[PDB]
Design a protein around this motif. Structure first.
Motif, PDB file in Angstrom:
ATOM      1  N   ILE A  66      16.902 -23.797 -31.711  1.00  0.00           N
ATOM      2  CA  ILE A  66      17.502 -23.775 -33.072  1.00  0.00           C
ATOM      3  C   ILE A  66      18.363 -25.035 -33.253  1.00  0.00           C
ATOM      4  O   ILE A  66      18.187 -25.726 -34.277  1.00  0.00           O
ATOM      5  N   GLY A  69      16.044 -27.714 -33.850  1.00  0.00           N
ATOM      6  CA  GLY A  69      15.553 -27.635 -35.240  1.00  0.00           C
ATOM      7  C   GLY A  69      16.500 -28.320 -36.211  1.00  0.00           C
ATOM      8  O   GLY A  69      16.011 -29.061 -37.095  1.00  0.00           O
ATOM      9  N   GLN A  71      18.763 -30.697 -35.500  1.00  0.00           N
ATOM     10  CA  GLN A  71      18.734 -32.148 -35.171  1.00  0.00           C
ATOM     11  C   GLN A  71      17.578 -32.823 -35.937  1.00  0.00           C
ATOM     12  O   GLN A  71      17.806 -33.916 -36.503  1.00  0.00           O
ATOM     13  N   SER A  74      18.312 -32.774 -39.555  1.00  0.00           N
ATOM     14  CA  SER A  74      19.530 -33.634 -39.671  1.00  0.00           C
ATOM     15  C   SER A  74      19.123 -35.110 -39.738  1.00  0.00           C
ATOM     16  O   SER A  74      19.788 -35.864 -40.451  1.00  0.00           O
ATOM     17  N   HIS A 108      26.937 -36.906 -43.158  1.00  0.00           N
ATOM     18  CA  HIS A 108      27.268 -35.527 -42.709  1.00  0.00           C
ATOM     19  C   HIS A 108      27.975 -34.765 -43.839  1.00  0.00           C
ATOM     20  O   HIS A 108      27.740 -33.547 -43.969  1.00  0.00           O
ATOM     21  N   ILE A 111      25.230 -33.959 -46.192  1.00  0.00           N
ATOM     22  CA  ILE A 111      24.407 -32.937 -45.492  1.00  0.00           C
ATOM     23  C   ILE A 111      25.020 -31.559 -45.745  1.00  0.00           C
ATOM     24  O   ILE A 111      24.306 -30.699 -46.236  1.00  0.00           O
ATOM     25  N   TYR A 112      26.322 -31.408 -45.523  1.00  0.00           N
ATOM     26  CA  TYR A 112      27.054 -30.114 -45.643  1.00  0.00           C
ATOM     27  C   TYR A 112      27.162 -29.719 -47.125  1.00  0.00           C
ATOM     28  O   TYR A 112      27.136 -28.521 -47.420  1.00  0.00           O
ATOM     29  N   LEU A 115      23.392 -28.787 -48.035  1.00  0.00           N
ATOM     30  CA  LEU A 115      23.100 -27.589 -47.210  1.00  0.00           C
ATOM     31  C   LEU A 115      23.460 -26.321 -47.994  1.00  0.00           C
ATOM     32  O   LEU A 115      22.788 -25.301 -47.798  1.00  0.00           O
ATOM     33  N   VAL A 124      20.166 -19.239 -44.750  1.00  0.00           N
ATOM     34  CA  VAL A 124      19.814 -20.634 -45.163  1.00  0.00           C
ATOM     35  C   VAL A 124      18.275 -20.787 -45.176  1.00  0.00           C
ATOM     36  O   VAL A 124      17.615 -20.310 -44.216  1.00  0.00           O
ATOM     37  N   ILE A 126      15.142 -23.085 -44.379  1.00  0.00           N
ATOM     38  CA  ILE A 126      14.775 -24.104 -43.350  1.00  0.00           C
ATOM     39  C   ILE A 126      13.326 -24.556 -43.602  1.00  0.00           C
ATOM     40  O   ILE A 126      12.624 -23.880 -44.370  1.00  0.00           O
ATOM     41  N   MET A 133      16.631 -18.397 -42.236  1.00  0.00           N
ATOM     42  CA  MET A 133      17.362 -17.914 -41.045  1.00  0.00           C
ATOM     43  C   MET A 133      18.695 -17.309 -41.488  1.00  0.00           C
ATOM     44  O   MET A 133      19.416 -17.975 -42.233  1.00  0.00           O
ATOM     45  N   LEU A 138      22.307 -16.274 -36.813  1.00  0.00           N
ATOM     46  CA  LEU A 138      22.895 -17.558 -36.351  1.00  0.00           C
ATOM     47  C   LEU A 138      24.236 -17.283 -35.660  1.00  0.00           C
ATOM     48  O   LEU A 138      24.493 -17.908 -34.622  1.00  0.00           O
ATOM     49  N   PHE A 148      28.301 -22.272 -34.745  1.00  0.00           N
ATOM     50  CA  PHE A 148      27.801 -23.618 -35.106  1.00  0.00           C
ATOM     51  C   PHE A 148      27.717 -23.742 -36.640  1.00  0.00           C
ATOM     52  O   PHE A 148      28.237 -24.723 -37.194  1.00  0.00           O
ATOM     53  N   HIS A 234      33.246 -29.776 -36.679  1.00  0.00           N
ATOM     54  CA  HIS A 234      31.876 -29.900 -36.123  1.00  0.00           C
ATOM     55  C   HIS A 234      31.911 -30.747 -34.844  1.00  0.00           C
ATOM     56  O   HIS A 234      31.486 -30.239 -33.783  1.00  0.00           O
ATOM     57  N   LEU A 238      30.434 -30.208 -31.011  1.00  0.00           N
ATOM     58  CA  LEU A 238      29.495 -31.129 -30.306  1.00  0.00           C
ATOM     59  C   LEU A 238      30.131 -31.607 -28.993  1.00  0.00           C
ATOM     60  O   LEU A 238      29.467 -31.489 -27.938  1.00  0.00           O
ATOM     61  N   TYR A 255      27.799 -40.942 -34.408  1.00  0.00           N
ATOM     62  CA  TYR A 255      28.971 -40.411 -33.662  1.00  0.00           C
ATOM     63  C   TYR A 255      29.455 -41.460 -32.638  1.00  0.00           C
ATOM     64  O   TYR A 255      29.323 -41.215 -31.426  1.00  0.00           O
TER      65      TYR A 255
END
Ligand SMILES: CC[C@H](Cc1ccc(C(=O)NCc2ccc(OC)cc2C(F)(F)F)cc1)C(=O)O
Length: 257
Positions: A66, A69, A71, A74, A108, A111-112, A115, A124, A126, A133, A138, A148, A234, A238, A255
Motif C-alpha cells: 500500500i 502504491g 509512492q 505520488s 506535497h 497533493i494533499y 487528495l 479514498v 485510487i 480504499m 488504512l 499514515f 508526514h 517517513l 526530501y
C-alpha cells in the motif's frame, strides 16, 4: 467583483486559462471523483478494499504493498503538478533555481489539497477511480503505517466542507506554487507580483462562484497553514519509516531540505 471592466475581465481570463490547464494536466478532476463517489457515473464502478480479503481480491507485506502504491501515485501526481506549473503565466520566466524550488516545496501541498478531491468520510479513490480504499482499513495497518493517511482524511473533511470546485482549486493550486516565502528563493518580488495577481483572480472567482459563503477567501488562505503542518507531520512519519524499516529516488530528492 463590484465592477465588470478590463481588469476584472483579465482576472476571468487568467481563471479560464488556469482551469483549462488543470483539465489537460489532471485527468481525475473533483467533478468526476464526486460522480464516482456518489454513484452517478457508469464510466467505471470502483472495487472497494475494506479488509485483507478485499485487498488480495484487488502480515506487514500489505503495509509494504500500500505504501508502494502511494509512492507510484505520488510520482504520477508530481508529473501532473509539474505540467500544470508550466501553464501558470510568468512561472517559466524565473531562474530555473526558483522554478525547481517553488515545486520542491509545493508538490506535497498540492497533493494533499487534490487528495481531498478523491476522499469522502468512508475512504479514498485510487488507481484513477478503479478502486476505493476505506479510511478504517488504512487505519488498521501494522504500526506505524495505520496513521499514515488518517491526518490526510482529517484535513479532507474540513477542506471538502468549503465545497470548492475544479475552477476554485485551479487558481488556489497556482497560488500555493507561487509562494514567496519558500526557503532559498532568489527573486521573491516577481513571484509575489504573480501571486498578488493570482490572489486577485481567486478573490473574484470565490465571490462569483460562492454567493452565500462568508470569508471563504480568508478560510481558504488559512488552509495553507494546515497544509504546511501535514507535510511536517508526514516527514516525521517517513523519518521513522527509514529508521524503523526504501523511497523512490524522485521522492528522496524532494526530501533534501
Ligand atoms: C508515500 C506518498 C507520500 C505522499 C502521498 C502521495 C499520494 C497519496 C495518495 O494518492 N494516496 C492514495 C492512494 C493511491 C494509490 C494507492 O495504490 C494502492 C493507494 C493509495 C492509498 F493507500 F489509499 F493511500 C498519499 C500520500 C510522499 O510523497 O511522501
Amino acid at each position: 467583483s463590484m465592477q465588470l471592466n478590463p481588469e476584472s475581465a483579465d482576472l476571468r481570463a487568467l481563471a479560464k486559462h488556469l482551469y483549462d490547464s488543470y483539465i489537460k494536466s489532471f485527468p481525475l478532476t473533483k467533478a468526476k471523483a464526486r460522480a464516482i463517489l456518489t454513484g452517478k457515473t457508469t464510466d467505471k464502478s470502483p472495487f472497494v478494499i475494506y479488509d485483507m480479503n478485499s485487498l488480495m481480491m484487488g502480515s506487514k507485506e500489505v503495509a509494504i504493498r500500500i505504501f508502494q502504491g502511494c509512492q507510484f501515485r505520488s510520482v504520477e501526481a508530481v508529473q501532473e503538478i509539474t505540467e500544470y506549473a508550466k501553464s501558470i503565466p510568468g512561472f517559466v520566466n524565473l531562474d530555473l533555481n526558483d522554478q525547481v524550488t517553488l515545486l520542491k516545496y509545493g508538490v506535497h501541498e498540492i497533493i494533499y489539497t487534490m487528495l481531498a478531491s478523491l476522499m469522502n468520510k468512508d475512504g479514498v479513490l485510487i488507481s484513477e477511480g478503479q478502486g476505493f480504499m476505506t479510511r478504517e482499513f488504512l487505519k488498521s495497518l501494522r504500526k506505524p503505517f495505520g496513521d499514515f493517511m488518517e491526518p490526510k482524511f482529517e484535513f479532507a473533511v474540513k477542506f471538502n466542507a468549503l465545497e470548492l470546485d475544479d475552477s476554485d482549486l485551479a487558481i488556489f493550486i497556482a497560488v500555493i506554487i507561487l509562494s514567496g516565502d519558500r526557503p532559498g528563493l532568489l527573486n521573491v518580488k516577481p513571484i509575489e507580483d504573480i501571486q498578488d495577481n493570482l490572489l486577485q483572480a481567486l478573490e473574484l472567482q470565490l465571490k462569483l462562484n460562492h454567493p452565500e459563503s462568508s470569508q471563504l477567501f480568508a478560510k481558504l488562505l488559512q488552509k495553507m497553514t494546515d497544509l504546511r503542518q501535514i507535510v511536517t507531520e508526514h516527514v516525521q512519519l517517513l523519518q521513522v519509516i527509514k529508521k524503523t524499516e526504501s523511497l523512490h529516488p524522485l521522492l528522496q530528492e524532494i526530501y533534501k531540505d
